[PDB]
Design a protein around this ligand. Structure first.
Ligand SMILES: *[C@@H]1O[C@H](CO)[C@@H](O[C@@H]2O[C@H](CO)[C@@H](O)[C@H](O)[C@H]2NC(C)=O)[C@H](O)[C@H]1NC(C)=O
Ligand SMILES: CC(C)CCC[C@@H](C)[C@H]1CC[C@H]2[C@@H]3CC=C4C[C@@H](O)CC[C@]4(C)[C@H]3CC[C@]12C
Ligand SMILES: *[C@@H]1O[C@H](CO)[C@@H](O)[C@H](O)[C@H]1NC(C)=O
Ligand SMILES: [K+]
Ligand SMILES: [Mg+2]
Ligand SMILES: [Tl+]
Ligand SMILES: [Tl+]
Lengths: 992, 39, 268
């Protein structure tokens, strides 16, 4: 469906103005007829974007109500009402058991539904942001007259007019223009104004001057044009549809959840029906056969687990909110940890998005300035008298000014009225020479010649601030070579000197080096005009050369670039040390893209492209073995004629990849290419041209300050302070939460065994029921909750940023090793500790373990109010039941006591508690509150009716203590083996 | 005692409940103290 | 295979065999020590049987015994359980001076055979003739229910003293030696008739205290036969038999705590 939109567009900028009118039945001068425009409206439809059909929240909520655990809990809830129905008909049961348990279980499903619904959130308003880029109104020429109309009423063929400050209402063929410049950052991510004129200037319509696009704005001048595309058919309207239309897809974390749901659901249905038939064979009435099944359901399903996961995710997202990293989708909290490839935009993401002075060439020396936002570098020069001469030209031969009321904000961050290069120079001098306004007050400008297309230079004449002179100084800047052809002397370390071929060659060298760094280079020179030849009232003519512009003194060079953000180089290296592959994907030109790649460490030192090898060896590129080149730089124009299989080979064959001059669909294609190889991919960006890629990414991260509204709609995560170091933190947090989820899951599952085994022995042994159904829910929904959550606050056991990204095909959240430990080893020890306390309670009340076998028949018989114990005493029905429920209560408390040790062992997968310590305060809180809850549930009056919880005698609490301790020792010995031999036996069997 | 051994079939479940609830409360307070050591 | 290789499948079996073996051996060990802390003659706790339960022979479907006099197999169900109990009180079962003893044919005081020790043989229990149960196949019309006080080791059932007012106000009040049992329904549409030891409507105190199964096997607890020769027919009659005493109490939950709940209906 969207495969059409993933392709490069076709256009009609090649046609003549006249020819273009024939195609759209239009007038170049009079414009369309009121009737013809209305006709075309009904024909083509409105100049608007329609949002894609969404899934209502209704269906979204209910889709969770049927996912493995909820299905089993539904079967339980209904099976409760089943047994209740069968009762209400047969023998009038005045009880509330099956009825209430059926109500409780149905509530558990609904509430669990809210948790998973909260986790599976999708806040997407892509198409809405795009719609915000179409103006409310447009100016059209109809019947030879200009009028404002609803922009939706704009059709292909009419004559539109735009001017500085307004949004392009539709894709236009420029037919007339006067000084028109446009901001195409929507399509390129670059905000430098692009001229628009009627002349065709490139085969590529996205590069030609005679096309203006919807989603962009006119920055200055005026233009008229013929509408060629409207609504969904515009270049960026299609990007809108592509972006808004892209299928979301399941996250890595989501896939893991479903996976263990299958496992646990599997064992549940297995043991469920495996013992349902095992009971009927033993001659159990279907009346009972279902009651046992309900218990089996409740025992096997970890009722509180899915909600635990959600809370652990939420708490991890809260910590990241506190580092200026907003998470829109709870699952995106983990994806960053599983990320193996980052596709990053350059401008406004890796870079500050601001022309900044990078180097200066004066005194036959290359000086480097500090490009960082917060200025974390050092000085270059202050002493040289040459510097002050260059500094003066940079301030004086400059027409840029700071906007009013910025004195509060830092120099480099403040808004400037002017072109990017003049702003850069302004901020450079203001920083290291103080107020520039002061320099422009001490040296009043009397005449100037602003930068001309033809002159290729800008000159200014000022009253020298010096009192002993107060004469006229000439300054000029422009193209380095043009400035050179106008110089005779060079200000070396203070004093001038003739411009010999020697210094002239050093100039060329300096010029070539700076240009090689992808930096824009300017020349600077001045000339102190002779006093006798220029009186204090001498008039200077700016129109006609009234003053010399030759034999001037060359002062120096200055170079500039849109520099990396301070934290970016280090963040890139850190991603790469964690084994994450970092690719650059930018709409910017290749020379600039490549230079920043080396600056931030995308391309490491020494690595070459095929073009680099060819130039170094002075040989044809076809003569170069492409396998000798680990780095590559792909232009979008070449990308366009490559198949995906060939794109896949590029991705496979290079470690250091730069995709430059890419369109928005091309970014999507590169992302998909990476994913196709089985990689989890993150995208980082800030422009509307990142929207499709951000949507398709497993996780999209947008910049918060510099980011466009669209990009932040398309993302899963926002960096609110533009701190790229947050990606590094995000991946670290993502890995940590993945491990801690394992700990929390194992902990929760472990207590399933002591809830399952009592029901089994109840059938096979014919003893009184050791633990009840209600009692199970008091564990999974009550006591285990805070402890399970607390594992989310566990510190790393080792340097997680030192390991490679997990293999999502092999490294699962819940594997066989977890089940073996939780179900086969620790849970089994917990089961016994439960049974022990059960036998203790009964034996101390007169029913010794031996006489318990095959007694349930008489025990449950409501009409036998005289059962004989081991000592020959006789018990009524309600009397023995009180002891039985007291058994449920102590078995319950036994679970809590054995979960103490389990909580401590689940703390660490490898390390010892004596190494990791007990610095998790939430965990300790869990221990205290868990025990408080259990005690309250046993001793609070009335709980014997609502939950069948009975007061325990002090000695009862200590039954499971020896089992709780064996768990601690056992797991500590086991992990001691793991560490002592990384070999594999204990490791490959039990290492979560 | 002999025929007056009524205490043999008696248990102070009332005190046990009072003590049990005291303990539960104090464990609840202790927990808050440790948690609130930083919020 | 599914998971691993044969070598791995073996090792995982050798482990869980030794592992579960140890766990079973430990579990058994903790059961040993538990038993080691317990007496053979007396349970550690008795507060959960404390107030004695009162149970009868007619096995009630739901605290009810409804049947038809004009039908044979209508009551043959209740006669099965009635027979089961009384079959134990046979004279052929009580033979010789061992381990039985002839006790007062009239309600007497308690009998202490020492302590709950094995320092003596089987503590000798009082004989009880089912022949003390006058009038009661059993009552084919108007049932002859048999009551019973639940056995509790070392329990001395103490009758109420005639200090103040009483339900069966002072009638045949053998204050010193009889634990009374008065059945009731207002709703007085019946005819209560009690049979027992010495002809009294109670339990003779000479059968106490019970020394337990280990120290007193073949022991016989006193019975109290109750006959309802009601002149009514074809209606549910809620009859409650209540025992009175210092050590006797009741509960709204446990409807068998020192009392009966019988729903007789001679629907004939
Ligand atoms: C306990 O006493 C009952 C009294 O009914 C015995 O029942 C006797 O059963 C036999 C054989 O079935 C009959 O011939 C008699 O008529 C019954 N009564 C009597 C008085 O002998 C019953 O057998 C006795 N049980 C034991 C174990 O001795
Ligand atoms: C109540 C009692 C009788 C039930 C005992 C169940 C035992 C036999 C179960 C419980 C947990 C189970 C193990 C759980 C995990 C694994 C790892 C997997 O890669 C192979 C199977 C294996 C090794 C299972 C084998 C059987 C097992 C040990
Ligand atoms: C009980 O049986 C006796 C004979 O043993 C008889 O005289 C008497 O009438 C019976 N009593 C009743 C109330 O039927
Ligand atoms: K995404
Ligand atoms: Mg950008
Ligand atoms: Tl469970
Ligand atoms: Tl659990």
């Amino acid at each position: 469906l969207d495969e059409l939109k993933k392709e490069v567009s076709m256009d009609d900028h090649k046609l003549s103005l006249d020819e273009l009118h024939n195609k759209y039945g239009t007038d170049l001068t009079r414009g369309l007829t009121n009737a013809r425009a209305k006709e075309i409206l009904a024909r083509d439809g409105p100049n608007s974007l329609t949002p894609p059909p969404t899934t209502p929240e209704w269906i979204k909520f209910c889709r969770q109500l049927f996912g493995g655990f909820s299905i089993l809990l539904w079967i339980g809830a209904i099976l409760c009402f089943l047994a209740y129905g069968i009762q209400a008909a047969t023998e009038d049961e005045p009880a509330n058991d099956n009825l209430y348990l059926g109500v409780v279980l149905s509530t558990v499903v609904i509430v669990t539904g809210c948790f998973s619904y909260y986790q599976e959130a999708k806040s997407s308003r892509i198409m809405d942001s795009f719609k915000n880029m179409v103006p409310q109104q447009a100016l059209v020429i109809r019947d030879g007259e200009k009028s404002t109309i609803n922009a939706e009423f704009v059709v292909a063929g009419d004559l539109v007019e735009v001017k500085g400050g307004d949004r392009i209402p539709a894709d236009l063929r420029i037919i007339s223009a006067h000084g028109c410049k446009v901001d195409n950052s929507s399509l390129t991510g670059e905000s430098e104004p692009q001229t628009r004129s009627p002349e065709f200037s490139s085969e590529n319509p996205l590069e030609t001057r005679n096309i203006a696009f919807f989603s962009t704005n006119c920055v200055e001048g005026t233009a008229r044009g013929v509408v060629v595309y409207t609504g969904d058919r515009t270049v960026m309207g299609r990007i809108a549809t592509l972006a808004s239309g892209l299928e979301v897809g399941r996250t890595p974390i989501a896939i893991e959840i479903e996976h263990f749901i299958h496992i646990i659901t599997g064992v549940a249905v297995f043991l469920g029906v495996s013992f349902f038939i095992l009971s009927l064979i033993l001659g159990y009435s279907w009346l009972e056969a279902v009651i046992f099944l309900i218990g089996i359901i409740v025992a096997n399903v970890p009722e509180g687990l899915l909600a635990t996961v959600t809370v652990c995710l939420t708490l991890t997202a809260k910590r990241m909110a506190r580092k200026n990293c907003l998470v829109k989708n709870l699952e995106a909290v983990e994806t960053l940890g599983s990320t193996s490839t980052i596709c990053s935009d350059k401008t406004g993401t890796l870079t500050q998005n601001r022309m900044t002075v990078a180097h200066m060439w004066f005194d036959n020396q290359i000086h480097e300035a500090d490009t960082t936002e917060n200025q974390s570098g050092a000085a270059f020069d202050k002493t040289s008298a040459t510097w002050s001469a260059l500094s003066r030209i940079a301030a004086l031969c400059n027409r840029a000014v700071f906007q009013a009321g910025q004195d509060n904000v830092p120099i480099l961050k403040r808004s400037v009225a002017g072109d990017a290069s003049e702003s850069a120079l302004l901020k450079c001098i203001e920083l290291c020479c103080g107020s520039v306004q002061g320099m422009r007050d001490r040296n009043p400008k009397i005449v100037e010649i602003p930068f001309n297309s033809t002159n290729k230079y800008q000159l200014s004449i000022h009253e020298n601030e010096k009192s002993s002179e107060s004469r006229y100084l000439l300054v000029m800047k422009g193209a380095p070579e043009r400035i050179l052809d106008r110089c005779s002397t060079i200000l070396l370390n203070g004093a001038e000197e003739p411009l010999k071929e020697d210094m002239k060659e050093a100039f060329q060298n300096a010029y070539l080096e700076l240009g090689g760094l992808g930096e824009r280079v300017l020349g600077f020179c001045h000339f102190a005009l002779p006093e006798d030849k220029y009186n204090e009232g001498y008039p200077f003519d700016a129109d006609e050369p009234n003053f010399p512009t030759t034999d001037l003194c060359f002062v120096g060079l200055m170079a500039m670039i849109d520099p990396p953000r301070a934290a970016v180089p280090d963040a890139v290296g850190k991603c790469r040390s964690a084994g994450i592959k970092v690719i650059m994907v930018t709409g910017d030109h290749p020379i600039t893209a490549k230079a920043i790649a080396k600056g931030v460490g995308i391309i490491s030192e020494g690595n070459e492209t095929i073009e680099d090898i060819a130039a170094r060896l002075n040989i044809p590129i076809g003569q170069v073995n492409p396998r000798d080149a680990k780095a590559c730089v792909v232009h979008g124009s070449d990308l366009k004629d490559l198949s995906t299989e060939v794109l896949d080979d590029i991705l496979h064959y290079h470690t250091e990849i730069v995709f430059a001059r890419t369109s928005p669909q091309q970014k999507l294609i590169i992302v998909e290419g990476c994913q196709r190889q089985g990689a989890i991919v993150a995208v980082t960006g800030d422009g509307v041209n990142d929207s499709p890629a951000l949507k398709k990414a497993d996780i999209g991260v947008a910049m918060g300050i510099s980011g466009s509204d669209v990009s932040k709609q398309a993302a899963d995560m926002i960096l609110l302070d533009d701190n790229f170091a947050s990606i590094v933190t995000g991946v670290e947090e993502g890995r940590l939460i993945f491990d801690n989820l394992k700990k929390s899951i194992a902990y929760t599952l472990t207590s399933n065994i002591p809830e399952i085994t009592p029901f089994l022995v109840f059938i096979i042994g014919n003893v009184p029921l050791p633990l009840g159904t209600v009692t199970i829910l008091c564990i999974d929904l009550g006591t285990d909750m805070v402890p399970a959550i607390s594992l989310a606050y566990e510190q790393a056991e080792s340097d997680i940023m030192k390991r490679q990204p997990r293999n999502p095909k092999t490294d699962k959240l819940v594997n066989e090793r977890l089940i073996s430990m939780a179900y086969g080893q620790i849970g089994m020890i917990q089961a016994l500790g439960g049974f022990f306390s059960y036998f203790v309670i009964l034996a101390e009340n007169g029913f010794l373990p031996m006489d318990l076998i095959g007694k349930r028949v008489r025990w449950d018989d409501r009409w036998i109010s005289d059962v004989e114990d081991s000592f020959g005493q006789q018990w009524t029905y309600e009397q023995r039941k009180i002891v039985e429920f007291t058994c449920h209560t102590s078995f319950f408390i036994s679970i809590v006591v054995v979960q103490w040790a389990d909580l401590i062992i689940c703390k660490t997968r490898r390390n010892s508690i004596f190494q990791q310590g007990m610095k998790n305060k939430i965990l300790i809180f869990g221990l205290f509150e868990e025990t408080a809850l259990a005690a309250f549930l046993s001793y609070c009056p009335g709980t014997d009716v609502a939950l069948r919880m009975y007061p325990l005698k002090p000695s009862w609490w200590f039954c499971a203590f020896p089992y709780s301790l064996i768990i601690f020792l056992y797991d500590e010995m086991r992990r001691f083996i793991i560490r002592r031999s990384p070999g594999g036996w204990v490791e490959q069997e039990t290492y979560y | 005692e002999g025929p007056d051994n009524d205490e043999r079939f008696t248990y102070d479940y009332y005190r046990l409940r009072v003590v049990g609830l005291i303990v539960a409360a104090v464990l609840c307070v202790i927990g808050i103290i440790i948690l609130l050591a930083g919020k | 295979f599914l998971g691993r290789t044969g070598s791995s499948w073996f090792k995982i079996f050798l482990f869980y065999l030794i592992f579960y073996g140890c766990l079973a051996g430990i579990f058994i060990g903790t059961i040993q020590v538990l038993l080691l802390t317990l007496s053979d003659f007396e349970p550690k706790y008795q507060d959960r049987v404390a107030p004695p339960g009162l149970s009868h022979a007619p096995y009630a479907i739901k605290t009810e015994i409804s049947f038809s006099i004009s039908n044979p197999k209508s009551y043959e169900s209740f006669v099965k359980s009635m027979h089961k109990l009384m079959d134990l009180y046979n004279e052929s079962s009580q033979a010789g001076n061992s381990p039985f003893e002839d006790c007062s044919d009239t309600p007497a005081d308690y009998i202490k055979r020492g302590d709950l020790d094995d320092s003596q043989g089987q503590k000798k229990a009082c004989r009880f003739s089912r022949m003390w149960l006058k009038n009661c196949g059993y009552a084919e019309g108007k049932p002859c229910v048999v009551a019973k006080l639940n056995r509790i080791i070392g329990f001395y059932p103490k009758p109420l003293k005639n200090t103040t007012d009483l339900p069966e106000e002072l009638q045949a009040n053998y204050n010193q030696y009889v634990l009374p049992l008065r059945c009731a329904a207002r709703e007085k549409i019946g005819s209560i008739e009690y049979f027992g030891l010495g002809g009294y409507a109670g339990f003779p105190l000479q059968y106490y205290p019970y020394y337990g199964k280990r120290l007193q096997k073949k022991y016989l607890q006193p019975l109290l036969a109750i006959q309802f020769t009601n002149l009514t027919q074809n209606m549910e009659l809620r009859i409650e038999c209540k025992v009175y005493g210092e050590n006797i109490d009741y509960s709204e939950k446990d409807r068998f705590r020192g009392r009966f709940e019988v729903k007789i209906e001679v629907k004939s």
